[PDB]
Each structure stands twice: as structure tokens, then as C-alpha cells.
Amino acid sequence: TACRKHELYVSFQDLGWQDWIIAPKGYAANYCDGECSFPLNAHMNATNHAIVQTLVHLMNPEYVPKPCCAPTKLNAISVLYFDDNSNVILKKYRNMVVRACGCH
Amino acid sequence: TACRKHELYVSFQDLGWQDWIIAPKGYAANYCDGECSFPLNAHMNATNHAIVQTLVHLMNPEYVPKPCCAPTKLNAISVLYFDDNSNVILKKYRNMVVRACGCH
């Protein structure tokens, strides 16, 4: 249960685009989850602030929370879809897929 | 209650580092806390992935978590301190001061 990438497939049908969209029908979003605690590394899986915040949190747990597990690397996906007129449109959406997670 | 920056002063004395850290004595570190839900404000430049994750969380609160509230802008601080060898060292530390929080 440490801060890590969890798999998550998201279907455009559930997002309301089942009409326009030709392909893909969904994509692997994934998501970051898990607790942020030592060991931490300001050059890989954390920031300085996260480290300092963790320390401060350990010696004051009620008032200051742990940092939270969030993406460090996101990828784009491309979708092909229909228009009013039968226009086939290819469109790239950035920061759509989680590839890596870290404590922030 | 929403995702936002909170004041937090960090004194190197509370941390136990007063012995060797020459300057500064401490610094406004701040941190991020609070719910990531809609309305997902402009100022908090949420990624695409975050918009999706919030949606999916709404449909599956038990399965997928809310995005995590985390720094969008950090500042560096410089610290002057003694080595264990008594060398006087100056070192700019990045990602030290939380200046803005987003949803990630």
C-alpha cells in the first residue's frame, strides 16, 4: 500500500462519448494511490517538500497530513471520432495516462 | 474545505537540525490539503487525468479515489549550514516552499 500506479481502464461509454468516438472505446487511465512515508527520495519518488512535510507530519500527526500520492509521469492518448457532418477527426489529449506516481 | 494552500512554518529547531543549520532559522513551507471535487477551479490547473479520475470516483467512490491535492508551484530556499567536518556550505534546495496547490 505504498504510493504506486494502480491499473484503471476507462470506457468512453461511461464518460458520455459513446456517440462520436470511433476508436479506442476506452483507455488505461490507471491512478496513483497508497501512503506516502519514508523511505523517500527527492530525486525519484518525492520532493524536498514532501520529505519535510512527512517529517513535520510524524511529529504532529493531527494538524499536518502526509503528502499524497500523485502522478510524476503522464502520457497522452489519441482518439479518432465523428462530427456533425461525417468528419473523421483525430485528436490528441495530453496528460491522460498515469505512468508513474510519487509523493508530493 | 476544498483543495488549497495552508500556512505552515517550519523551524529547523522543531526538526532537530538547529545544531548545524546556520541560516535560516526556519521558513514558511506551507502545504496542500482539502477535497478535490467539482467544481474544479481554473486557478488550480488540474490535468485531464484529474478531471477523468474525479468523474470515475463519482461513479465508483468505493473503487477509485479522489485526486490528491498537491503542489503546483514550489519555491527553492537556500540553506547555510555546517558539515560534520565544520565546512561552511551553502546549498539552494528546490521544491521547498509550496506556493500553490492543484488537483492531481
Curated annotation (Swiss-Prot), chains A, B:
Glycosylated at Asn-45. Glycosylation is crucial for recognition by the activin receptor type I/ACVR1. It comes from Homo sapiens. The chain holds residues 410 to 513 of 513 of the full protein. GO terms for molecular function: BMP receptor binding; cytokine activity; growth factor activity; protein heterodimerization activity. This is Bone morphogenetic protein 6. The keyword Signal applies. Glycans are attached at residue 45. Belongs to the TGF-beta family. GO terms for biological process: BMP signaling pathway; bone development; cartilage development; cellular response to BMP stimulus; cellular response to iron ion; cellular response to mechanical stimulus; endochondral ossification; eye development. Growth factor of the TGF-beta superfamily that plays essential roles in many developmental processes including cartilage and bone formation. Also plays an important role in the regulation of HAMP/hepcidin expression and iron metabolism by acting as a ligand for hemojuvelin/HJV. Also acts to promote expression of HAMP, potentially via the interaction with its receptor BMPR1A/ALK3. Initiates the canonical BMP signaling cascade by associating with type I receptor ACVR1 and type II receptor ACVR2B. One of its GO terms (cellular component) is extracellular space. Interacts with SOSTDC1. Interacts (when glycosylated) with type I receptor ACVR1; the interaction may induce HAMP expression. Interacts with type II receptor ACVR2B. Interacts with Hemojuvelin/HJV. Interacts with ERFE; the interaction inhibits BMP-induced transcription of HAMP. Interacts with BMPR1A/ALK3. Forms heterodimers with BMP2 in vitro; the heterodimer then binds to its receptor BMPR1A /ALK3 and may induce HAMP expression. Keywords: Chondrogenesis, Cleavage on pair of basic residues, Cytokine, Developmental protein, Differentiation, Disease variant, Disulfide bond, Glycoprotein, Growth factor, Osteogenesis, Secreted, Signal. The gene is BMP6. It is found in: Secreted. The keyword Disulfide bond applies. Disulfide bonds join 3-69, 32-101, 36-103. It is linked to Iron overload: A disorder of iron homeostasis with incomplete and age-dependent penetrance. It is characterized by adult onset of increased hepatic and systemic iron levels, increased serum ferritin, normal or high transferrin saturation, and inappropriately low or normal levels of hepcidin. The severity of the phenotype depends on age, sex, as well as additional genetic or acquired factors including alcohol consumption and increased body weight.
